[PDB]
Amino acid sequence: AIAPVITIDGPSGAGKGTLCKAMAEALQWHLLDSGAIYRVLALAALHHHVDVASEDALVPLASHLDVRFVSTNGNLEVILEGEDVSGEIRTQEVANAASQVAAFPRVREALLRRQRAFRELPGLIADGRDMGTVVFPDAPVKIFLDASSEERAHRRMLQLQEKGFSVNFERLLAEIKERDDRDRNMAVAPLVPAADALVLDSTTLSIEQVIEKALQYARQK
């Protein structure tokens, strides 16, 4: 007793986000956005003066987390413990922590069941860095979008350039390069594609083409 899926994962900046809003739009498939979750988890950790450094304090917060996602409106507002926090989880600090919050074995666990319960007819698209390596290791579909460092950098340090912020290519470069040698050497929660994941790059690829591509693989299998 279960419904179909998909597993569009990959590193930040890869544009796996907007890709999902098609997978899920053209298909009307429940769009599960992970990253956010952690981002709320981290936020909640922050305001709850919970020591995001202490793995011995990030599991309770998770296993009783009040985080849900809106329906079909303008885009997708994430809600927390009773109030909206979209713009706040998209902060340039919440992530530094949301990067800490997701680097602990037990964390994921408590977040685990909280995710697997997202599946439902017809299907559930899943943005993330592991929707195959762990959560949906049975998803007929398994896309793994990817993008170089210099580029994924642009794909961000620029994406926020016309959003009223200041940032330098040099920094964010290092910043993402950092998470890589982290996410990589990471032990658990690597970032390597699912042994049957369609490795799909997008550096010199267009977003209109990634969609194009992706979908091809979709209904196919």
Residues that bind ligand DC (CB under 6 A): 12, 34-36, 38-39, 95, 98-99, 102, 128-130, 189
Does 12 belong to an annotated binding site? yes
- In the bound state with ligand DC, the residue whose beta carbon lies nearer, of 159 and 216, is 159
In the complex, minimum distance from the CB of residue 135 to ligand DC, in angstroms, rounded to a whole number: 8
In the complex, minimum distance from the CB of residue 96 to ligand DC, in angstroms, rounded to a whole number: 9
- Cα–Cα distance measured from residue 7 to residue 180, given in angstroms and rounded to the nearest whole number: 20
- In the bound state with ligand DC, the residue whose beta carbon lies nearer, of 105 and 219, is 105
- In the bound state with ligand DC, the residue whose beta carbon lies nearer, of 40 and 220, is 40
Does 14 belong to an annotated binding site? yes
Does 202 belong to an annotated binding site? no
- Select the residue whose beta carbon is closest to ligand DC and give its number: 35
Annotated binding site: 10-18
